[PDB]
Symmetry: C2
Subunit: 222 residues, 2 copies
């Protein structure tokens, strides 16, 4: 899933260690951030005094940070469904999205796509205009945007741009439009704009769990 | 500095809240992550029982996460010095780097750039081959890579690629070479590969502070 190697690199880089050293050298900074949180502001002076020792221990072995980054990577996986009858293009787009950290499913079957989306509930749909067996990405897109359960699912249409402007003005329109021939990396960036990029989503979950842990300990012990 | 707007978007997104809901629904997963950390494994059942309540409180108002992300943004700035005599090019590259979140300084004075780097200790140097007053980026790069204090400062040379191959084989070589005319955006990503991207660095600091806080509280109370 998410590609955290560079982020793991940062955690071990000299610069990260020096920057955290600097940030915690004057405790006014951290005391202020701590005191912004009503639930943490009663943290006593003994605990604040252990902030620098605990960071030093943390950097000699940052299992705490690595533990939570791993949790986030595991739950920060977002899923993209590609509805595209051009198998070769669908496979190329899947590997690029997978190469960015996304989980990707694929289907040739325009007619079954709407109910498949309902069943599997992907985080984003890449939907080609020109599909097999007389199905059409514009038609499929109109069905999804008319459905109250599925209308908030982001759809990126890929296809001949001839019809984009007119389809965009419809009340049931796609969330984005990407012209064919599609350059996979551009598509990757558009998916990351609509939903998260996997590494940022993983760090957000890692931080959320770390905060929840600190708040739960505080709640019981202050 | 760092541009957190997408990251702040994620934290307020419905998907992030649902993913966090799912993650804490079965506490086996969270218990395992907690128990990986010797300093946290003795967290009592009362505190573990407050994990979902505190998370719910977190999502009603995520001041904890916001205050840590803001701390990280404030200390996640990394500084790039551009040594380039072409003022128009230096300005364009600076604004592209600043647009991605880096702090950027500029100079046309190659003669004094070595000592300026020593004084200011930037995290990365963009160094043009062709400079004014008979200075040369290859020569400057050789001075820096022979200096024990500054030889670990990453240098991205920009210029005529004619001399890249030969300079690369020298013992005092640059860390990266980018041909002129420079595509600013790819220069940006080369800087992000050598040092962090600012948003990832900021999230790393935010997670580090969160973990240090949780570990210090735990150290004092269990």
């Amino acid at each position: 899933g998410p590609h955290m190697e560079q982020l793991e690199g940062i955690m071990l880089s000299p610069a990260f260690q020096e920057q955290m050293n600097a940030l915690m050298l004057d405790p006014r900074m951290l005391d202020m951030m701590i005191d912004q949180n009503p639930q943490l502001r009663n943290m006593g002076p003994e605990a604040r005094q252990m902030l620098r020792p605990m960071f030093r221990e943390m950097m000699s072995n940052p299992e705490s940070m690595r533990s939570m980054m791993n949790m986030g990577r595991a739950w920060g996986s977002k899923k993209i469904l590609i509805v595209e009858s051009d198998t070769a293009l669908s496979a190329t787009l899947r590997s690029a999205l997978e190469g960015r950290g996304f989980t990707v499913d694929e289907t040739t079957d325009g007619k079954g796509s709407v109910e498949q989306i309902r069943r599997d509930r992907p985080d984003l749909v890449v939907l080609a205009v020109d599909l097999s067996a007389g199905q059409n990405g514009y038609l499929i897109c109109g069905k999804l945007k008319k459905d109250d359960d599925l209308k908030n699912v982001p759809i990126v249409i890929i296809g001949n741009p001839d019809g984009f402007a007119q389809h965009r003005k419809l009340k049931a329109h796609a969330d984005e439009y990407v012209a064919k021939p599609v350059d996979a990396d551009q598509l990757v960036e558009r998916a990351g704009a609509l939903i998260g990029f996997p590494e940022g989503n993983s760090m957000m979950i890692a931080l959320g769990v770390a905060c929840a842990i600190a708040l739960a300990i505080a709640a019981v012990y202050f």
